[PDB]
Design an enzyme around this catalytic site. Structure first.
Site, PDB file in Angstrom:
ATOM      1  N   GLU A 284       0.789  -1.042  -0.023  1.00  0.00           N
ATOM      2  CA  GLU A 284       0.017   0.115   0.035  1.00  0.00           C
ATOM      3  C   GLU A 284       0.874   1.368   0.132  1.00  0.00           C
ATOM      4  O   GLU A 284       0.290   2.313   0.570  1.00  0.00           O
ATOM      5  CB  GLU A 284      -0.993  -0.177   1.146  1.00  0.00           C
ATOM      6  CG  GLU A 284      -0.346   0.169   2.383  1.00  0.00           C
ATOM      7  CD  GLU A 284      -0.015  -0.987   3.413  1.00  0.00           C
ATOM      8  OE1 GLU A 284       0.445  -2.099   2.804  1.00  0.00           O
ATOM      9  OE2 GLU A 284       0.366  -0.920   4.521  1.00  0.00           O
TER      10      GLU A 284
ATOM     11  N   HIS B  60      -8.073  -3.920  -0.766  1.00  0.00           N
ATOM     12  CA  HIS B  60      -7.419  -3.829   0.385  1.00  0.00           C
ATOM     13  C   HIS B  60      -6.347  -2.822   0.327  1.00  0.00           C
ATOM     14  O   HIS B  60      -6.047  -1.958   1.436  1.00  0.00           O
ATOM     15  CB  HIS B  60      -6.667  -5.354   0.365  1.00  0.00           C
ATOM     16  CG  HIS B  60      -5.953  -5.333   1.781  1.00  0.00           C
ATOM     17  ND1 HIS B  60      -6.099  -6.287   2.857  1.00  0.00           N
ATOM     18  CD2 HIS B  60      -4.510  -5.047   2.135  1.00  0.00           C
ATOM     19  CE1 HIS B  60      -5.139  -6.155   3.597  1.00  0.00           C
ATOM     20  NE2 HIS B  60      -4.173  -5.513   3.131  1.00  0.00           N
ATOM     21  N   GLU B  61      -5.436  -2.506  -0.694  1.00  0.00           N
ATOM     22  CA  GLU B  61      -4.771  -1.735  -0.606  1.00  0.00           C
ATOM     23  C   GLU B  61      -5.353  -0.002  -0.622  1.00  0.00           C
ATOM     24  O   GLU B  61      -4.703   0.805  -0.046  1.00  0.00           O
ATOM     25  CB  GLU B  61      -3.582  -1.814  -1.831  1.00  0.00           C
ATOM     26  CG  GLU B  61      -2.957  -3.017  -2.089  1.00  0.00           C
ATOM     27  CD  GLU B  61      -2.391  -3.555  -0.799  1.00  0.00           C
ATOM     28  OE1 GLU B  61      -1.837  -2.917   0.048  1.00  0.00           O
ATOM     29  OE2 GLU B  61      -2.355  -4.935  -0.767  1.00  0.00           O
TER      30      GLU B  61
HETATM   31  O1  LIG Z   1      -0.537  -9.430   0.044  1.00  0.00           O
HETATM   32  C1  LIG Z   1      -0.982  -9.493   1.244  1.00  0.00           C
HETATM   33  N1  LIG Z   1      -0.569  -8.523   2.024  1.00  0.00           N
HETATM   34  C2  LIG Z   1       0.286  -7.305   1.983  1.00  0.00           C
HETATM   35  C3  LIG Z   1      -0.519  -6.399   2.516  1.00  0.00           C
HETATM   36  O2  LIG Z   1      -0.905  -6.361   3.900  1.00  0.00           O
HETATM   37  N2  LIG Z   1      -0.942  -5.416   1.770  1.00  0.00           N
HETATM   38  O3  LIG Z   1      -1.557  -4.402   1.984  1.00  0.00           O
HETATM   39  C4  LIG Z   1       1.562  -7.652   2.302  1.00  0.00           C
HETATM   40  C5  LIG Z   1       2.405  -6.656   1.936  1.00  0.00           C
HETATM   41  C6  LIG Z   1       3.811  -6.803   2.433  1.00  0.00           C
HETATM   42  C7  LIG Z   1       4.435  -7.742   3.071  1.00  0.00           C
HETATM   43  C8  LIG Z   1       5.662  -7.800   3.414  1.00  0.00           C
HETATM   44  C9  LIG Z   1       6.161  -7.823   4.633  1.00  0.00           C
HETATM   45  C10 LIG Z   1       7.817  -8.097   4.460  1.00  0.00           C
HETATM   46  F1  LIG Z   1       8.104  -8.144   5.740  1.00  0.00           F
HETATM   47  C11 LIG Z   1       8.552  -8.098   3.550  1.00  0.00           C
HETATM   48  F2  LIG Z   1       9.992  -8.309   3.533  1.00  0.00           F
HETATM   49  C12 LIG Z   1       7.922  -8.016   2.244  1.00  0.00           C
HETATM   50  F3  LIG Z   1       8.670  -8.102   1.245  1.00  0.00           F
HETATM   51  C13 LIG Z   1       6.576  -7.922   2.145  1.00  0.00           C
HETATM   52  C14 LIG Z   1       3.526  -8.895   3.473  1.00  0.00           C
HETATM   53  C15 LIG Z   1       2.243  -8.619   3.105  1.00  0.00           C
HETATM   54  C16 LIG Z   1      -2.063 -10.582   1.645  1.00  0.00           C
HETATM   55  F4  LIG Z   1      -1.948 -10.561   2.698  1.00  0.00           F
HETATM   56  C17 LIG Z   1      -3.459 -10.110   0.869  1.00  0.00           C
HETATM   57  F5  LIG Z   1      -3.877  -8.832   1.303  1.00  0.00           F
HETATM   58  F6  LIG Z   1      -4.475 -11.173   1.267  1.00  0.00           F
HETATM   59  F7  LIG Z   1      -3.330 -10.144  -0.444  1.00  0.00           F
HETATM   60 ZN   LIG Z   2      -2.304  -4.896   3.948  1.00  0.00          ZN
END
Ligand SMILES: O=C(N[C@@H](C(=O)NO)c1ccc(-c2cc(F)c(F)c(F)c2)cc1)[C@@H](F)C(F)(F)F
Ligand SMILES: [Zn+2]
Ligand SMILES: [Mg+2]
Ligand SMILES: [Mg+2]
Ligand SMILES: [Mg+2]
Ligand SMILES: [Mg+2]
Length: 889
Positions: free
Chosen positions: A268, A301-302
């Site tokens: 995000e 979500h983002e």
């Molecule tokens: O992509 C996801 N989560 C990301 C998120 O919350 N986006 O808003 C997400 C983003 C970055 C990271 C992340 C964490 C770290 F510590 C890293 F090193 C990295 F490369 C990514 C993990 C999850 C999934 F949980 C989702 F949202 F279901 F798709």
């Molecule tokens: Zn998230």
């Protein structure tokens, strides 16, 4: 190995007010110049100035334009830059540095890296320190002024946070862009992107302020025709935040960018959201149906993070669930409203009770706000996200929509522009609670236990009905099993959404009612109950708990047919299935142990089979729901209910039960498969990327589920249906034709056909890989070897690696081959992956999470491979840490 503790939070002795970056991208290296305008905080005690900086090559560092010299004034150990306090100014000062980094060979995909021909950053959680020196923690808020330069031909599109305030030419075929982003932000939300990007764009006008927002969605040129649904979803997201929460976007522009190589779904970064291509790009010709809901949830979500995470951010990483659990909850509200199908909520519950319940009864169990961590890259868990979301959703269930919206707006208005903690949110909810309950003495102090207590609560029931008194009683008990995090578990605030069904006419007997269970046990009594009801418990799955409904199968069947709540109907079916599974499992296990020459199996309840038939034949019932009821509970849900689970015996148990039901219903299945075709496969809007029909997609899910059941059964001449299905324009159908053909001589013919259809679209080929990986083939190991040699090879793309191996690990019969050959195979892949991408290597550990729940032979086999991986001299911090926790070492 540094362990960080939540209780140890202390604010920094320094302040960073302004970041001024020059990022110069070259062929063999990237040069980063940074000036930090800094100050001394009130918490300073004359300490050394210590910056995070990982893998940086120092060209120079200075304070107030005076060059510092290594050894005398500073030390750098490839992790921390230490400037000795006698050389640190006592008032406002400038720190500057020039470092060299190498995105080209950055295969871990954290910091600044190259994905195909796109330069891209990923800074959450502590990746910014791989780009330049910083105090890399989210409470260090600063303004950002960022200039990017690059070869113009290779990188014509340059993006970062904030407004593009200058664009300029540079001698030697180079060019630059300057972005100024005045609002304070934590460094994990910094992003930069450079590449030959193509875009779709639109203008959105906000609901209240009537601000024009420019929306841009970017991809490599090859896939620009796959951007349209994403743009639609972005518009939808913006409208939902306006309509439900009264929240408008505050910036002039929002960019979404797809990259091929990404560790997760998306990120995000403020005004510059960056996506795994598989979570942003789709077309009806080149994507399976699942992509459409996936893009909707991830774009949503983002977007929702712009408030819950970006404008209101985190004090520290222990508060992760405050932005992730809350943003997943906002995304669930959104997708439920957009899809208008009951299977959206059911799909979330299905995931929670399989994957997250497994995690919570594993050695890795943690609360949604952990007390410690070693690796942030391992912190992003289904517990923090999905149990987090259920905890955020319970506030809505407890308060109701009106007071929930009031509480949520209190949270936003009070914390907008600041860092926050889980307590700030609970506090805001509590204010609403006081209003709803009409006394300022009411509080939610007990609610906080949902943030600190690990493990899944068990909620159980007993009932009493007095026919003369017309008085009904529900006795409720809660229990959480002690674990490594709490020896003594405390009762939680558990909201129990309930209905009472009249078994004679199927009608509701009381108004909407949410029982507030706050003790270890309570008795809830209802008067003027005219007849003995069947209780409808935890409607909508109103708390993240193991439900023990103590109902008979006759009662459960009545609810399955006549209850008003989709989850309770779905759960009643699940519970009938589980009673059967446990019974047949024990019978098979006994036969195996005692080496019986003959034995009996308890047949499937015939009234249950009759109920499934009834619902399937109801033309007014929902296709998506129908596909859930003919599917047994997920293996990872079942395993929470069996000690020392023999996966072979469970495979035999599932086989028996599916065969029992199919022996009665296959003709019904076949009839529906044929009758559903016209509506399910309707091509009217196949070339309109803006038209998405979630009901139609559910009809296809139902057809494809039925086709699978019929193929496994070797239904007479079903192969003809399979071949015809392979000629469908919908990839969900023709990829389904491949997996169901596994049971026939035609499998490799369809393998080749579908490969040829898939090979020229990167994401479609990954879907084909998954389809092969999860094919029910006796020669699946030989097939995996073929994929490795012919298709996967030495790709470092996490999408490719995950596609080839993860679906196979869910093959109950073959992954868990008693030789241990499947465990050996996945450990080799984990170790190989760990060399270049530790975060994805630990994702690939997922099948080992249940190791101590299996039979003793398979426990031993899994543990042997994990100890083998732990003994690898070059093992990463991520993987070592994870396997140490998982193996209780
Ligand atoms: O992509 C996801 N989560 C990301 C998120 O919350 N986006 O808003 C997400 C983003 C970055 C990271 C992340 C964490 C770290 F510590 C890293 F090193 C990295 F490369 C990514 C993990 C999850 C999934 F949980 C989702 F949202 F279901 F798709
Ligand atoms: Zn998230
Ligand atoms: Mg380096
Ligand atoms: Mg509107
Ligand atoms: Mg590729
Ligand atoms: Mg342990």
């Amino acid at each position: 190995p540094k362990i960080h503790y939540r209780k140890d939070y202390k604010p920094s002795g320094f302040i960073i007010n302004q970041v001024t970056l020059n990022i110069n991208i070259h062929d063999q290296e990237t040069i980063v110049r940074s000036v930090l305008d800094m100050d001394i905080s009130k918490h300073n005690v004359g300490e050394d100035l210590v910056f995070d900086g990982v893998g940086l090559k120092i060209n120079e560092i200075s304070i107030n334009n005076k060059k510092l010299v290594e050894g005398e004034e500073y030390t750098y150990d490839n992790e921390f830059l230490t400037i000795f306090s006698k050389f640190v100014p006592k008032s406002k000062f400038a720190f500057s540095s020039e470092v060299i980094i190498h995105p080209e060979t950055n295969y871990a995909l954290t910091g600044l890296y190259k994905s195909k021909n796109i330069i891209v950053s990923q800074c959450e959680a502590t990746g910014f320190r791989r780009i330049t020196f910083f105090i890399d923690r989210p409470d260090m808020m600063a303004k950002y002024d960022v200039t990017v330069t690059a070869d113009k031909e290779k990188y014509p599109v340059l993006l970062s946070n904030g407004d593009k305030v200058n664009e300029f030419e540079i001698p030697g075929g180079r060019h630059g862009a300057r972005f100024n982003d005045p609002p304070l932000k934590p460094c994990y939300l910094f992003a930069v992107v450079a590449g030959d990007l193509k875009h779709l764009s639109a203008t959105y006008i906000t609901k209240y302020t009537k601000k024009k927002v420019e929306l841009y969605v970017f991809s490599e040129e090859k896939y620009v025709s796959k951007l349209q649904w994403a743009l639609e979803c972005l518009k939808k997201s913006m409208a939902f935040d306006e309509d439900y929460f009264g929240l408008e976007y505050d910036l002039s522009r929002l960019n979404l960018v797809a990259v091929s190589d990404f560790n997760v779904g998306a990120m995000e970064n403020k005004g510059l959201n960056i996506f795994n291509a598989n979570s942003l790009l789709a077309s009806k010709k080149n994507s399976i149906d699942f992509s459409y809901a996936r893009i909707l949830t991830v774009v949503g979500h983002e977007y929702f993070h712009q408030y819950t995470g970006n404008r209101v951010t985190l004090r520290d990483w222990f508060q992760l669930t405050l932005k992730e659990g809350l943003t997943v909850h906002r995304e669930n509200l959104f997708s439920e409203e957009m899809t208008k199908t009951v299977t959206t909520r059911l799909s979330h519950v299905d995931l929670l009770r399989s994957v997250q319940f497994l995690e919570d009864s594993s050695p890795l169990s943690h609360p949604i706000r952990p007390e410690s961590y070693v690796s942030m890259e391992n912190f992003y868990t289904t517990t923090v996200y999905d149990k987090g979301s259920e905890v955020m959703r319970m506030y809505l269930t407890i308060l109701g929509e009106e007071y929930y919206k009031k509480g949520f707006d209190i949270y936003i208005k009070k914390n907008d522009g600041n860092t926050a903690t889980c307590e700030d949110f609970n506090y805001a909810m509590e204010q609403a609670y006081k209003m709803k309950k009409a006394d300022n003495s009411a509080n939610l102090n007990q609610y906080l236990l949902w943030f600190s207590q690990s493990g899944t609560p068990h909620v159980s029931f007993k009932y009493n009905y007095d026919a003369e008194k017309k008085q009904y009683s529900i006795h409720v008990n809660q229990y959480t099993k002690p674990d490594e995090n709490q020896k003594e578990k405390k009762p939680l605030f558990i909201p129990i959404s309930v209905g009472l069904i009249n078994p004679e006419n199927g009608k509701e007997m009381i108004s909407q009612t949410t029982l507030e269970l706050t003790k270890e046990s309570d008795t809830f009594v209802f008067n003027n109950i005219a007849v003995k009801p069947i209780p409808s418990l935890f409607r909508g799955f109103s708390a993240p708990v193991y439900i023990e409904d103590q109902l008979t199968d006759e009662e459960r069947i009545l609810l399955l047919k006549y209850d008003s709540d989709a989850f309770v109907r779905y759960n009643s079916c699940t519970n009938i299935y589980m009673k059967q599974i446990l019974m047949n499992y024990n019978e098979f296990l006994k036969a195996k142990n005692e080496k019986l020459e003959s034995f009996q199996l308890t047949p499937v309840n015939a009234q249950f089979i009759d109920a499934i038939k009834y619902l399937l034949e109801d033309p007014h019932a929902d296709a998506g729901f129908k596909s859930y009821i003919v599917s047994l509970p997920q293996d990872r849900y079942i395993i929470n209910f069996v000690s020392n689970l023999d996966t072979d015996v469970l495979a035999d148990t599932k086989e028996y039960i599916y065969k029992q039901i199919g022996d009665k219903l296959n003709d019904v299945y076949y009839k529906m498969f044929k009758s559903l075709e016209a509506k399910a496969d309707d091509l009217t809007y196949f070339n309109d990327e803006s038209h998405v029909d979630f009901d139609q997609m559910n009809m296809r899910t139902l057809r494809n589920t039925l086709l699978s059941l019929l193929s496994k059964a070797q239904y007479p001449n079903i192969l003809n249906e399979i071949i015809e299905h392979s000629k469908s324009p919908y990839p969900s159908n023709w990829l389904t034709s491949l997996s169901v053909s596994a049971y026939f001589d035609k499998y490799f013919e369809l393998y080749d056909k579908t490969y040829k259809l898939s090979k020229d679209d990167e994401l479609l080929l990954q879907e084909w890989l998954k389809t092969v990986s999860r094919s029910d083939r006796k020669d699946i190991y030989e097939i995996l070897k073929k994929l490795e040699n012919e298709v996967l090879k030495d790709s470092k793309n996490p999408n490719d690696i995950r596609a080839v191996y993860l679906p196979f690990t869910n093959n109950l019969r073959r992954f868990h081959d008693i030789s241990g050959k499947g465990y050996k195979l996945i450990a080799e892949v984990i170790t190989k992956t760990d060399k270049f991408n530790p975060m994805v290597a630990t994702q690939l550990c997922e099948p080992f999470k249940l190791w101590n729940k299996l039979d003793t032979k398979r426990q031993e086999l899994m543990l042997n491979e994990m100890n083998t991986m732990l003994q690898e001299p070059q093992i990463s911090n991520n993987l070592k840490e994870y396997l140490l926790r998982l193996t209780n070492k």
